[PDB]
Amino acid sequence: AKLETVTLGNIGKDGKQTLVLNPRGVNPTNGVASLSQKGAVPALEKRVTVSVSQPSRNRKNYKVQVKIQNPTACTANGSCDPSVTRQAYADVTFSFTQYSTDEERAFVRTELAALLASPLLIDAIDQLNPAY
Amino acid sequence: AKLETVTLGNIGKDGKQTLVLNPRGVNPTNGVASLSQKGAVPALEKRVTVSVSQPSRNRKNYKVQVKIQNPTACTANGSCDPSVTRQAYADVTFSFTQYSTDEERAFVRTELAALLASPLLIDAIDQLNPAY
Amino acid sequence: AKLETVTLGNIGKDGKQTLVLNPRGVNPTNGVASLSQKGAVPALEKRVTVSVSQPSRNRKNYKVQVKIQNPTACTANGSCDPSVTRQAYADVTFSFTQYSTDEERAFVRTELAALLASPLLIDAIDQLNPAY
Amino acid sequence: AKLETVTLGNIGKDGKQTLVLNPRGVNPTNGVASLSQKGAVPALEKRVTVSVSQPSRNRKNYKVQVKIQNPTACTANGSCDPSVTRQAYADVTFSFTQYSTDEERAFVRTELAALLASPLLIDAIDQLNPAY
Amino acid sequence: AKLETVTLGNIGKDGKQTLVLNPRGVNPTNGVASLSQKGAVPALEKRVTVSVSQPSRNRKNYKVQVKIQNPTACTANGSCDPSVTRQAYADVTFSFTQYSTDEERAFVRTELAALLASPLLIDAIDQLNPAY
Amino acid sequence: AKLETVTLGNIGKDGKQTLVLNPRGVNPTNGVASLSQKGAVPALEKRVTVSVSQPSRNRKNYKVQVKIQNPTACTANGSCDPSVTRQAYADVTFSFTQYSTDEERAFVRTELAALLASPLLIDAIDQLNPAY
Numbered sequence: 001a002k003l004e005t006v007t008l009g010n011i012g013k014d015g016k017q018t019l020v021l022n023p024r025g026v027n028p029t030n031g032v033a034s035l036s037q038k039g040a041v042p043a044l045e046k047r048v049t050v051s052v053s054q055p056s057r058n059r060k061n062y063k064v065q066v067k068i069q070n071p072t073a074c075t076a077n078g079s080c081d082p083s084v085t086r087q088a089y090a091d092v093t094f095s096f097t098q099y100s101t102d103e104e105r106a107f108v109r110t111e112l113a114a115l116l117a118s119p120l121l122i123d124a125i126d127q128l129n130p131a132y
Numbered sequence: 133a134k135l136e137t138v139t140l141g142n143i144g145k146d147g148k149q150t151l152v153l154n155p156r157g158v159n160p161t162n163g164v165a166s167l168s169q170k171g172a173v174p175a176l177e178k179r180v181t182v183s184v185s186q187p188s189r190n191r192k193n194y195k196v197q198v199k200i201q202n203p204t205a206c207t208a209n210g211s212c213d214p215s216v217t218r219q220a221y222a223d224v225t226f227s228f229t230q231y232s233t234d235e236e237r238a239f240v241r242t243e244l245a246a247l248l249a250s251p252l253l254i255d256a257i258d259q260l261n262p263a264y
Numbered sequence: 265a266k267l268e269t270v271t272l273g274n275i276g277k278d279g280k281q282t283l284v285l286n287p288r289g290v291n292p293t294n295g296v297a298s299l300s301q302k303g304a305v306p307a308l309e310k311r312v313t314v315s316v317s318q319p320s321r322n323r324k325n326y327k328v329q330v331k332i333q334n335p336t337a338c339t340a341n342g343s344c345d346p347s348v349t350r351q352a353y354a355d356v357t358f359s360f361t362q363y364s365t366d367e368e369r370a371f372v373r374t375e376l377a378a379l380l381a382s383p384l385l386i387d388a389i390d391q392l393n394p395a396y
Numbered sequence: 397a398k399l400e401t402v403t404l405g406n407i408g409k410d411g412k413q414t415l416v417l418n419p420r421g422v423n424p425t426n427g428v429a430s431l432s433q434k435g436a437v438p439a440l441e442k443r444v445t446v447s448v449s450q451p452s453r454n455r456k457n458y459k460v461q462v463k464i465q466n467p468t469a470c471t472a473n474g475s476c477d478p479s480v481t482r483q484a485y486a487d488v489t490f491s492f493t494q495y496s497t498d499e500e501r502a503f504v505r506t507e508l509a510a511l512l513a514s515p516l517l518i519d520a521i522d523q524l525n526p527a528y
Numbered sequence: 529a530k531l532e533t534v535t536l537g538n539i540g541k542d543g544k545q546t547l548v549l550n551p552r553g554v555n556p557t558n559g560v561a562s563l564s565q566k567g568a569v570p571a572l573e574k575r576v577t578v579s580v581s582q583p584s585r586n587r588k589n590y591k592v593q594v595k596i597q598n599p600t601a602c603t604a605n606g607s608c609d610p611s612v613t614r615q616a617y618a619d620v621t622f623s624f625t626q627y628s629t630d631e632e633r634a635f636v637r638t639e640l641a642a643l644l645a646s647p648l649l650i651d652a653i654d655q656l657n658p659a660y
Numbered sequence: 661a662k663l664e665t666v667t668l669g670n671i672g673k674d675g676k677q678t679l680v681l682n683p684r685g686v687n688p689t690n691g692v693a694s695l696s697q698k699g700a701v702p703a704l705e706k707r708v709t710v711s712v713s714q715p716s717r718n719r720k721n722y723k724v725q726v727k728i729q730n731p732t733a734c735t736a737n738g739s740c741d742p743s744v745t746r747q748a749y750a751d752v753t754f755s756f757t758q759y760s761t762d763e764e765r766a767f768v769r770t771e772l773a774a775l776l777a778s779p780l781l782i783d784a785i786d787q788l789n790p791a792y
Contacts, residue, residue: 158528174524213470
């Protein structure tokens with residue numbers, strides 16, 4: 001699909017924020033499309049990547065991979081310009097057989113999505129609580 | 133959060149299906165909670181796992197990990213009982229600093245979720261099309 | 265199922281006695297749920313353990329394992345406090361396939377319970393006579 | 397006791413079915429008494445095996461071992477005769493001391509039978525759920 | 529006991545403060561229950577861990593082990609977010625024999641608690657003066 | 661503090677008993693102040709030991725260490741004089757930075773003492789129940 005400005009809505013804990021990511025390259029050396037919420041400085045922008053990899057000699061499954069990396073900056077320092085003090089990461093890889101159907105693929109995608117909005121996952125990710 | 137029957141709604145390509153997963157263990161040897169949409173036979177059920185792992189000696193980040201595995205069965209065979217003929221997989225790991233906040237964690241969670249419903253990801257996962 | 269006070273009924277040679285086992289842990293290091301008839305002192309209590317283990321790399325089937333250990337104590341000694349003089353053990357191990365059914369599983373369970381109430385087993389266990 | 401047709405009643409998950417096992421050998425030559433629900437063909441019959449073994453040099457305790465083996469057959473194939481696609485196994489060994497009493501042995505036997513009819517065990521064997 | 533919000537009262541030098549700890553997982557990899565006083569950020573919260581370990585082959589006694597880790601944070605920095613500058617620890621392990629009684633165990637428990645509230649301990653701990 | 665007859669009250673399961681320990685040395689070879697309850701014979705007396713150790717070459721924290729050792733005696737024997745049949749132990753060591761404060765240490769002291777009267781700890785120590 002068109003590497004275009006993807007715009008995500010009603011995210012954040014309260015469900016009220018917005019993220020705008022702009023096309024920011026393909027093909028670095030490895031086919032991974034890149035997006036970024038453009039900020040003051042490269043180190044300070046939230047990134048996303050997407051890469052579909054066809055099956056080959058060793059690879060027999062298709063693998064779609066998504067990566068989120070969100071830096072946190074703190075301007076006060078022993079200096080003037082803000083610095084990255086931590087990163088948040090997500091990393092999802094999907095693995096699909098060459099004989100799979102789009103219905104099975106779309107099920108895994110929509111299932112993961114609905115899962116991420118569930119009390120079990122809200123507690124595990126937002127509060128870092130295991131399950132009992 | 134209570135390892136309870138999580139119920140996911142309006143999933144699938146059309147957005148009209150439902151998934152019901154029932155608590156099906158914790159603590160196999162590795163703290164991973166398990167859920168399953170209960171089906172006729174173990175090999176035939178859709179599974180989910182969740183595991184939060186505190187930081188330790190080598191681990192300094194928290195890592196939350198989610199796994200979807202959905203089998204496809206075909207009953208006709210050279211036999212009577214259905215057999216698994218492929219698996220669909222998702223695998224997401226989140227990586228968070230000990231100094232991160234729930235707002236940063238909930239952002240990465242809701243962002244991934246909203247991302248999974250976007251044209252770029254619909255094409256990459258459902259149609260296995262890279263990005264241009 | 266809820267790791268709850270199991271209570272067992274009319275056991276013993278006459279089938280008139282009662283055993284009450286109280287939840288006494290999970291996960292020592294190995295997922296082994298534990299029960300125990302509470303007694304004067306830890307070494308003198310009867311124990312039960314159950315462990316379901318899923319299939320992995322090495323293990324392809326499911327394995328359910330139940331253990332029983334009943335100490336016999338004798339308070340007279342060259343001492344005051346009762347001491348264990350022997351144990352009685354039972355260790356049972358069910359092995360079921362990824363494709364097994366709950367009917368097949370319940371049959372083995374109810375068969376083994378019924379088999380244990382039968383003349384041939386009653387003589388092999390209770391009087392230690394083989395079979396002819 | 398007399399290796400004789402043992403007949404077992406209301407087994408199965410509904411507790412309505414009957415199993416008839418016919419004496420089918422003794423020794424073979426590990427002392428293993430054998431039984432078998434008469435079947436169309438040897439691979440297709442449910443078996444049971446009982447063995448008592450006296451304490452010797454290496455063995456100082458008595459050990460009684462009982463094994464159930466139930467195959468599942470499937471008539472359809474790429475052939476006419478039914479084939480075995482899976483087995484269900486139970487394997488129980490009792491370990492008793494030279495100084496145990498018949499009352500102590502009978503307690504273990506009847507405890508195991510009672511224990512096999514309890515919610516905790518029904519869920520671990522029939523539904524393959526661990527305990528929480 | 530149910531892993532609950534344990535609430536502790538009248539602690540601190542003056543005996544006037546309160547600490548609330550919330551069940552924050554079990555079984556990371558080691559049967560270690562966890563609790564934590566809800567803090568702004570993971571690295572900033574007071575933790576407690578409890579584990580009861582049964583006797584094994586290496587371990588012949590029971591061992592109960594409790595850990596306290598309270599961090600101190602200072603927000604002024606060459607930064608914005610508060611950082612951890614030190615940790616206070618308490619690590620207690622109890623050791624009891626298979627034949628110990630609950631009265632003997634509660635004596636050690638209540639004796640230690642009484643001991644900690646005593647002039648000799650107050651000066652050893654709060655003022656780091658040895659004894660003479 | 662002056663090594664003085666410490667007296668502790670309302671200890672034991674019921675909270676009704678009293679414990680008088682008497683100064684019984686210092687400086688054996690290791691700065692370990694020692695106490696003890698008046699016992700018929702040295703092997704039969706409850707001991708306590710406290711040691712504060714300053715930071716050093718290897719050691720950079722202060723360490724305060726307390727030990728409890730309560731023997732159980734059984735007078736009946738193949739003898740006249742009582743013999744020790746088991747010991748109960750508690751071993752607490754606190755770890756504090758050179759930069760800690762008396763309020764931070766007193767917090768850890770009073771938190772341990774309050775923790776030791778809580779339903780969770782009572783069940784783990786007195787009844788040797790883990791946590792769920």
